[PDB]
Amino acid sequence: VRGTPVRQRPDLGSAQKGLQVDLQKLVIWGTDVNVAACKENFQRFLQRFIDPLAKEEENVGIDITEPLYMQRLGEINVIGEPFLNVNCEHIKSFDKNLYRQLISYPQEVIPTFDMAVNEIFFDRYPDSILEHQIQVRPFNALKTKNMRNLNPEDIDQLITISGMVIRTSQLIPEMQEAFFQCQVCAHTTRVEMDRGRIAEPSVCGRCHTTHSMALIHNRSLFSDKQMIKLQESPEDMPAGQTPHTVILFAHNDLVDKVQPGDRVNVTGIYRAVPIRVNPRVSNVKSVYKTHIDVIHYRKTDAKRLHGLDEEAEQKLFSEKRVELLKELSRKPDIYERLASALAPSIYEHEDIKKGILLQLFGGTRKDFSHTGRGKFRAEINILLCGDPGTSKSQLLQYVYNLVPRGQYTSGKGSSAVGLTAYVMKDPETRQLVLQTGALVLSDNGICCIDEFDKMNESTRSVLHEVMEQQTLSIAKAGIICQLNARTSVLAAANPIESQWNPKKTTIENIQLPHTLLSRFDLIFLMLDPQDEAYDRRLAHHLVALYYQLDMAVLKDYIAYAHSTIMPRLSEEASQALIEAYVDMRKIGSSRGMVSAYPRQLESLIRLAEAHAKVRLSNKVEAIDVEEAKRLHREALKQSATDPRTG
């Protein structure tokens, strides 16, 4: 302590009695924690804990020799943010009993950790100024593979779960310190919140008038709060169990930190609270409901790609990692290496994998506001038109499980309202609220539409606006707005009759309106060549799956590309693009082929920019535009189709 104001911890709930009980050492009532011992143990953990298996890439700006969290405290000194994220795994490795005490008694233990961190920090720094005393965030607790298995025995304990955010309610203010003024002499007093309630003065302390003191709402002190409806991603999925929605609650710093559709590991206290029979009576129900007072949000995932927030953050890569990635870029076959890395167990779909990689990398974001032109879609859209059993669904699922902010819909399982938005009755505030859809939840990510042909036009019409202007203009009875839907669409289509007739042309087989097909800036025909070598090697691969680049480098490469690569058209690439579009239109003028409109010049620009980004060039080049030409041409099998027939 150095005079810093110790801010309250609304996440830890209303303070309890805190009854000390001597066992004859001096535990807290109902627990086996003694404040002195817990504080000393955590102080020791901070002073001297080193991670032996830590990696320079895992920890950036952290020496694997010096104690871990002392450097974190140094960072908190350098910046103003007085928060310290402490790994429950590290605590378990250091002092296992300390970990068990933390997990079983979070409300009691965590304040001791706060005291210890404040003591150490203010001893080291007698002059650093912080708005409030540092606060400790314990995360990475042993993952709860399914909330449905948690039991009343686990209530009020620190758990950790994973899931995507479905909704985030508005900022709810919470009282912390009521302000009272006398209606006679104007005497002012303050009453801090105590155990989840406030005691009215009932008598003036200056004029002694009974009940002359009135509460001043807008002169009181409040704290932020926010309901967050999150959908659980249970690793353990027992038979017959439907998906799970769990109510979260953020407090005063986690409010509005995770948007809908974001996937997060949330560590927090598992609370059970009563249900009033009516919102007006105080009678409660014998059966409680449960929610999560969120202590920590973690975005990083091992099996996914870097999120938007992580990419935005400056210190995401060490200088060594940056140099390694730049070397990998200067490598000449980086494009094919990354394409092969994508979906490692999908056999030689080189062109489709390259297209999906370009989709992941994405073009450049352009600010055409000054031009009065509108908003240009930098995202790339792909349509895999193929016979059932051609692995298009497998590729769709791989992308869905790979990309952050990914949504998945199939066939007639969706609807226009369910994809765009709708109005429901939030069954915790009894208020009517607006719930997004898949196309919005995937706003800055990907939507995977399997069975893209069984999508009766009523809902397929919605995709026009999304794929053209990245906007979803909803004008319903009460709510008018335009939601950002800057998604990338990966769709899978089956030729009519579920089989590709080798007599009808490309368009006649696809059976999708040109208005829509011109939106997709890549269309891959997954067609089966009756080839001995292909069949034999495919059988070898499929059997090999029955008995036996790094994701890390791929993820880091994509993150760095998005972070600091903004390819710009060069003059030579511009002329090449002009010639490419004229030639492509000339070719597409054929009868049954996929005709090329200026949307296809836009598509070529997008693909060239994506390839330049893959190369980290920062300047789109004739090589990139030529590769875009080649990819768009091999897709649809233009080379293998005559300008008359298919």
């Binding site: 059966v287 791989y398 399997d450």
Partner: protein
């Protein structure tokens, strides 16, 4: 009337001096050992068998069956009184509630003053310091009752019913004893909750606050309180026991403690418990009187008759090489012929091994579609598979359509929330979904089935529902007629598409007619050389096979590749085959190896898989 102190002594005597030879013929104190366990806190639920009780005290059994709640409490109190004398060491404090109980007992001893008499309300409640729970197991002499017949005349009795579980809430914490802590004295207050609702207390009645005449506002909190795993399920009559024209009747079953997470929707269960009322105040009662709800408090839940949760004879039967054919012929013994069809159905019931190579799942489920003319027993086969498989949902054309196959959203009662209820596919999540009239099934339903086949999931993006379900089921479709109707859509997906054409033939028709007429004569198939296995045995063998994952040795790689390439050449020459067919080969061979109960698949399994595949293929021609 009866003296409940004498009854408590009787139950103590039984619980202490009852012995049985269950443990490998050696005499054992069946309940004494359990008492030792749950005094050490190694066991939670104590299931008193009323057959055991009746073995020496029939009158106690009658009294329990007449006033089960009273005797339930008597047994629980007897157990609690006996625990200290059966404890043989110190518990390791496995639970925070155990920590609370330890502290409470230690402080009561510290402030004991043994000679002093404390007020009846100045004591810890019984339920607050139990950490165990006593249930019954209905006497076998009590014939199970029908949910329809369980009426007001049997309230408070102990009854057992059987039916299909339709709706089951999730497990949520139900307050049993609310604990409050004062802000003046530092004592605790305990409110044992019995009604569905309670009004939290405001003023602390502790002696210190009563003497001080201070405020004594107490704070309800969950830390020191006593919750119990709670669930509420709906249990539905069985079709055979419903009256002529009525619909099946439902009953509400309240499950507590360790009985939770036993049953799931779609299970055939038998529940034994007490028929108890809930007071029905709050409404504007049209008719005067103390009307009340009705429910069964779950004491014993037993999955039965489709999903029940070894011997040298069965080991030898497995060791027999013709065990595969034995099981096949046992599948629907009444149905004459269709030997390869039944073998394919057995392979379906077994299933292949699931694969997870580098971030993508190749499910081991087997998909079979029975195309055939009218009256070739496709419906009978699907119904039999539904009765046989553990988690089986048999869906006809359109009665179960839309949300009848996919999940919907319904308002809750315990929480009043919107809960997601699964459809037929989810109810058969990890079993068999027998789709009948798949050709005539709706387009949305057909697309949902296609999606579940391709992904084992069900994505929904409608208004009230936005979820990605999980349905890892095996589809057994039975359509009727490219011959005359042979969609490439079905061909590209179904791993085994079987055509069942019944061309007239004097000899075969006469044999089938004799089979049918003997069946109608004797309610059973004609006697054969091999007696067909009983459904219980078939389920046991199939279940044991399921957990026998056999791998594919690299030696068979070239053999499989050669067979696949040969089939590709044949299909190309003729007037459909692909990687889906190759995966069908792989999983059928794996399932055959699993049936043989080996760890490595063999050329015999591969050959049998190819043979069944070729039979299916040339059934088209």
């Amino acid at each position: 009337l009866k003296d409940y102190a004498l009854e408590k002594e009787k139950v103590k005597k039984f619980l202490q001096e009852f012995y049985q030879d269950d443990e490998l013929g050696k005499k054992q104190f069946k309940y004494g050992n359990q008492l030792v366990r749950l005094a050490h806190r190694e066991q939670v639920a104590l299931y008193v068998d009323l057959d055991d009780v009746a073995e020496d005290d029939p009158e106690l059994v009658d009294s329990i069956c007449e006033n089960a709640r009273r005797y339930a409490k008597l047994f629980a109190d007897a157990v609690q009184e006996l625990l200290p004398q059966y404890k043989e060491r110190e518990v390791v404090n496995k639970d925070v509630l155990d920590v609370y109980i330890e502290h409470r007992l230690m402080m009561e001893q510290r402030s004991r003053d043994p000679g002093m008499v404390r007020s009846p309300q100045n004591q810890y409640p019984a339920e607050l310091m139990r950490r165990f729970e006593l249930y019954f197991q209905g006497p076998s002499s009590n014939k199970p009752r029908v949910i329809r017949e369980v009426r007001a005349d049997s309230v408070g009795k102990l009854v057992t019913v059987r039916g299909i579980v339709t709706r089951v809430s999730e497990v949520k914490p139900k307050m049993v004893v609310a604990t409050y802590t004062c802000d003046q004295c530092g004592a605790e207050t305990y409110q044992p909750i019995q009604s569905p609702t309670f009004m939290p207390l405001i003023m602390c009645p502790s002696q210190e606050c009563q003497t001080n005449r201070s405020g004594g506002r107490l704070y309800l909190q969950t830390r020191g309180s006593r919750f119990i795993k709670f669930q509420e399920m709906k249990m539905q009559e069985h079709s055979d026991q419903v009256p002529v024209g009525n619909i099946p009747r439902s009953i509400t079953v309240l499950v507590e403690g360790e009985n939770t997470r036993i049953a799931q929707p779609g299970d055939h269960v038998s529940v034994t418990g007490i028929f108890l009322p809930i007071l029905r105040t709050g409404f504007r009662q049209v008719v005067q009187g103390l009307l009340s709800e009705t429910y069964l408090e779950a004491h014993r839940i037993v999955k039965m008759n489709k999903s029940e949760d070894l011997t040298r004879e069965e080991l030898r039967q497995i060791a027999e090489e013709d065990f595969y054919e034995k099981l096949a012929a046992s599948i629907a013994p009444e149905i004459y012929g269709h030997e390869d069809v039944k073998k394919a159905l057995l392979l379906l019931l077994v299933g292949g091994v699931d694969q997870s190579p580098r971030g993508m799942k190749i499910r081991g489920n087997i998909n079979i579609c029975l195309m055939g003319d009218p009256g070739v027993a496709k419906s009978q086969l699907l119904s039999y598979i539904d009765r046989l498989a553990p988690r089986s949902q048999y869906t006809t054309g359109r009665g179960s359509s839309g949300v009848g196959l996919t999940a919907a959203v319904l308002r809750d009662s315990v929480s009043g929330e919107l809960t997601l209820e699964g459809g037929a596919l989810v109810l058969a999540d990890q079993g068999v979904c027998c789709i009948d009239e798949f050709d005539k099934m709706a387009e949305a339903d057909r697309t949902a089935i296609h999606e579940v086949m391709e992904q084992q999931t069900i994505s929904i993006a409608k208004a009230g529902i936005l979820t990605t379900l999980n349905a890892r089921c095996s589809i057994l479709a039975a359509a009727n007629p490219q011959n005359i109707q042979l969609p490439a859509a079905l061909l590209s997906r179904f791993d085994l598409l079987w055509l069942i054409q019944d061309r007239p033939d004097r000899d075969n028709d006469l044999r089938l007619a004799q089979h049918i007429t003997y069946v109608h004569q004797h309610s059973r198939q004609p006697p054969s050389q091999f007696e067909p296995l009983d459904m219980k045995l078939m389920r046991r063998y199939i279940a044991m096979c399921r957990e026998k994952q056999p791998m594919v040795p690299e030696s068979l790689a070239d053999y499989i590749t050669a067979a696949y390439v040969e089939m590709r050449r044949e299909a190309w020459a003729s007037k459909y085959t692909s990687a889906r067919t190759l995966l069908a080969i792989l999983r059928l061979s794996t399932a055959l190896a699993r049936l043989r109960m080996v760890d490595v698949v063999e050329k015999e399994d591969v050959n049998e898989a190819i043979r069944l595949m070729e039979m299916s293929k040339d059934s088209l021609l």
